[PDB]
């Protein structure tokens, strides 16, 4: 998609193994933020949004938390709390054309900046002067979108780059997207290390005696201490108690 009208795909109900993009192009940048990518196989995320668009290499610096510029302000804005990773790669051979690829456009003019993750596809004239443009351009009145015109004579900075920004959204419910792993038979009454949909801890597991309502997935005692959990396989409630410890 063009950057001004960028595409959003929600990814869910599946397993996210990233060994595929590892057998993908020589990456121009893999700048990932707030998460180690090498650990992106034990992810357990609830929702993942895949925003997609194309720019030139010179403009990839604007694709970062808290950035500024024509793209960051009038085209694609990222929030300061971004939790995800940004993967980009040169797509010159497919997206550059002889006289320039004029099908890729971006917004040059906007009265105010976009809010994070906002989309403005308006094509209405811009007023740089003090004359009201009545749906007419010309002097001081401009069309707000401008084509990139990708040419094979451009430097790599001006060459087309395909960019995919994965935003990892956290939560407290079924990580409907999880990582390629496996399961193991459940163990009870022993101090055991457990990994329930991402929660790692230690303790003794016991059959629960409290009535969880069908819409609940977690249990807490005072001070957010995870006291119980429902099985992602047996959908059974389990009690968690830290195994014995003390001073000597």
């Amino acid at each position, epitope marked *: 998609a063009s950057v001004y009208a960028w595409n959003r795909k929600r990814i869910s109900n599946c397993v996210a193994d990233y060994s595929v993009l590892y057998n993908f192009a020589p990456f121009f940048a893999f700048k990932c933020y707030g998460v180690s990518p090498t650990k992106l196989n034990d992810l357990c995320f609830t929702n993942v949004y895949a925003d997609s668009f194309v720019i030139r290499g010179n403009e990839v610096s604007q694709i970062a938390p808290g950035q500024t510029g024509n793209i960051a302000d009038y085209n694609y804005k990222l929030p300061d709390d971004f939790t995800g990773c940004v993967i980009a790669w040169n797509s010159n051979k497919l997206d550059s054309k*002889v006289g320039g690829n004029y099908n890729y456009r971006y917004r040059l003019f906007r009265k105010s900046n976009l809010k994070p993750f906002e989309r403005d596809i308006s094509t209405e004239i811009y007023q740089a002067g003090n004359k009201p443009c009545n749906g007419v351009a010309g002097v001081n009145c401009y069309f707000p979108l401008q084509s990139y015109g990708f040419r094979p004579t451009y430097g790599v900075g001006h060459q087309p780059y395909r960019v995919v920004v994965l935003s990892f959204e956290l939560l407290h419910a079924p990580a409907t997207v999880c990582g390629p792993k496996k399961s193991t038979n459940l163990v009870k009454n022993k101090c055991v290390n457990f990994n329930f949909n991402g929660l790692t801890g230690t303790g003794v597991l016991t059959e629960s005696n409290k009535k969880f309502l069908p819409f609940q997935q977690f249990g807490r005692d005072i001070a957010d201490t995870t006291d119980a959990v429902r099985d992602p396989q047996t959908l059974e409630i389990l009690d968690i108690t830290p195994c014995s410890f003390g001073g000597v």
Partner: antibody, heavy 119, light 109 residues
Framework: EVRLLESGGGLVQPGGSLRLSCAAS????????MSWVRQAPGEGLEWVST????????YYADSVKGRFTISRDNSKNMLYLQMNSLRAEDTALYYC?????????????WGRGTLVTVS | QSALTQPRSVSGSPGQSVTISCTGT?????????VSWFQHHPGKAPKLMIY???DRPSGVPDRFSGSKSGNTASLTISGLQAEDAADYYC?????????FGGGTKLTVL
């Protein structure tokens, strides 16, 4: 499936005029640059002219500059070459080509060729 | 011509290797990496064997390889087979024009 077909070759007298055509089929003609490449009897391939995917950009070889005119009809999936002041060194087999399967600047798709004889 | 300068003829025996060179100018071979190599039999359409100085399109064996140094490009054919005998043309895209080499006739005796 995806095809290019040249046409419009024949015997013509030196200094005359001819219009070549290239017929596209199986793809979005207006998404791709078009070029004319020829091969004169006993000679190698010679790039003649290139037109961009839109039609608003035409490139020609110096050896046939001025006298040759390239055009395309993106509505009809047709590419055209207008050769005027046809000289004897313009006798050749003429091909249209594009880069549908590689890049805009390559020649992966070809026609069958049209034979142009200048008396 | 203005073509890239190639040897006019090279001969090889089946199973052996042959390297073919392509020398151009600083505006084509020495400018960009948009160098092509073509296999051709007069009477049929050329078949792309090498585009991008060293890259093979789909269906071209690794016996065919390409190289470039300065204004000179080089194609090397290993494991010569009888069907490799053909005319071989280098090609350079230079932005404002494309230019083919003058061609090397490979004969597999």
């Amino acid at each position: 499936e995806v095809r290019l077909l040249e046409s419009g070759g024949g015997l013509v007298q030196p200094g005359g005029s001819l219009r070549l055509s290239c017929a596209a089929s199986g793809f979005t003609f207006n998404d791709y640059a078009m070029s004319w490449v020829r091969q004169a009897p006993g000679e190698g391939l010679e790039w003649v002219s290139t037109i961009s995917y839109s039609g608003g950009s035409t490139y020609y070889a110096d050896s046939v500059k001025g006298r040759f005119t390239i055009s395309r009809d993106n509505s009809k999936n047709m590419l055209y070459l207008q050769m005027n002041s046809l000289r004897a060194e313009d006798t050749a087999l003429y091909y249209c080509a594009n880069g549908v399967a590689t890049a805009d600047w390559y020649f992966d798709l070809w026609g069958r060729g049209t034979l142009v004889t200048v008396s | 011509q203005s073509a890239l300068t190639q040897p006019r003829s090279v001969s090889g025996s089946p199973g052996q290797s042959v390297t073919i060179s392509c020398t151009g100018t600083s505006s084509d071979v020495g400018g960009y990496n948009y160098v092509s190599w073509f296999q051709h039999h007069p009477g049929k359409a050329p078949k792309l064997m090498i585009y991008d100085v060293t890259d093979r399109p789909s269906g071209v064996p690794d016996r065919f390889s390409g190289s470039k140094s300065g204004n000179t490009a080089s194609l090397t054919i290993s494991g010569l087979q009888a069907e490799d005998a053909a005319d071989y043309y280098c090609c350079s895209y230079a932005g404002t024009y494309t230019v083919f080499g003058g061609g090397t006739k490979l004969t597999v005796l």
